[PDB]
């Protein structure tokens, strides 16, 4: 059910860092457990991951530095709404 999104302005993409957004009403404790689950599944497949931040207050989820090879696996995690590749913003 979860979908993947990346910036349409290809030079503004920042591959290798992803925002995993969980469903509305997902609690911080569930977000932290989902992040740990991704780390454990990725390590079993030989990939190193890093949880840079865990979100709560506006949107539930987390920021992860990992290979995009893990996106199909990450989209199957419980509570996932969608995943977005990080991208640049600029002073106007």
């Amino acid at each position: 059910t979860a979908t993947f999104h990346r910036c349409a302005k290809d030079p503004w993409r920042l591959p290798g860092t992803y925002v995993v957004v969980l469903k509305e009403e997902t609690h911080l404790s569930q977000s932290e457990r989902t992040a740990r689950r991704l780390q454990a599944q990725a390590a079993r497949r030989g990939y190193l991951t890093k949880i840079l931040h865990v979100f709560h207050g506006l949107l539930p989820g987390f920021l992860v530095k990992m290979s995009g090879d893990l996106l199909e696996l990450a989209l199957k995690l419980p509570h996932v709404d969608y995943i977005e590749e990080d991208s640049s913003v600029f002073a106007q």
Binding site: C7, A8, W12, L59, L63, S87, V89, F90
Partner: protein, 277 residues
């Protein structure tokens, strides 16, 4: 004499009941124009680069909102978060972490109405639009730059988020601002325009220096100042009522729509922001 932009929005050191959060570059908070009016938070989330130049953008915009000599809402207080590096570049993730920091700060120590100024843009982002929508639904007013790409603002974020007040830039002839070969964005995602050409404001080159700057960031900073004045006079306004006030007090049909691409003329609001009397 007075800067053209301050005369344009004038049909008292107002906006004192509102705090304006600024997500931008580092700021020279000791500049005489903004000293004591900008509180620098410990927040910093910036990407690596590819002090006077580092703080140029944010120092000027803080001056536009609340500056002693050239600010719009001289009574408003500001809190700054650093989400743009020395080259003016940030990330969607850093901006999300900053918006969450604002909400957390508000829950810990509530004050009056909050206005969040986002003088930045990237490509259309589902997550950035969702974080903005959630913060606006929580009761916080968000104002963003329409973008400087001479394009439809709906293709950029946070400009494309409907719950955010998206501001285009006009010049002293009330015409859309040109910025090199590009210029202000336009289209149905823009809520209104505001002065954004040759805006005199604090320069981080020296404690009392001033410089003129152009862009949709400057236009958005005018609207954040006008919103701070409106909310300080009528603190109970909802976001919908505030948007209705901004439209009501704007100058109507003064922009020559011929500058916009043909199909965008009916979709772009012909409104230039102004303070209430």
């Amino acid at each position: 004499s007075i800067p053209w932009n301050l005369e344009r929005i004038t049909p008292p050191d107002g906006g004192s009941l509102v705090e304006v959060y600024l997500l931008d570059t580092s700021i020279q908070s000791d500049h005489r124009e903004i000293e004591g009016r900008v509180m620098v938070t410990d927040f910093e989330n910036v990407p690596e680069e590819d002090a006077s130049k580092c703080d140029s953008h944010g120092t000027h915009l803080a001056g536009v909102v609340s500056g002693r000599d050239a600010g719009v809402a001289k009574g408003a207080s500001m809190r700054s978060l650093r989400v743009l590096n020395c080259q003016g570049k940030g990330t969607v993730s850093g901006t999300l972490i900053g918006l969450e920091f604002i909400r957390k700060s508000q829950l810990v120590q509530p004050v009056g109405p909050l206005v969040v100024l986002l003088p930045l843009a990237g490509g259309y982002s589902r997550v950035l639009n969702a974080a903005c929508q959630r913060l606006a639904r929580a009761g916080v007013v968000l104002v963003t730059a329409a973008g400087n790409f001479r394009d439809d603002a709906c293709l950029y974020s946070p400009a494309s988020a409907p719950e955010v007040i998206t501001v285009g830039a006009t010049n002293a002839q009330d015409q859309p601002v040109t910025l090199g070969t590009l210029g202000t964005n336009f289209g149905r995602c823009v809520d209104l325009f505001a002065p954004g050409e040759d805006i005199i404001g604090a320069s981080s080159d020296c404690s009392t220096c001033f410089v003129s700057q152009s862009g949709t960031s400057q236009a958005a900073a005018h609207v954040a100042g006008i919103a701070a004045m409106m909310l300080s006079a009528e603190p109970e306004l909802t976001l919908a009522e505030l948007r209705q006030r901004l439209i009501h007090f704007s100058a109507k049909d003064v922009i020559n729509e011929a500058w916009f691409p043909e199909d965008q003329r009916v979709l772009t609001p012909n409104l230039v922001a102004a303070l209430p009397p």
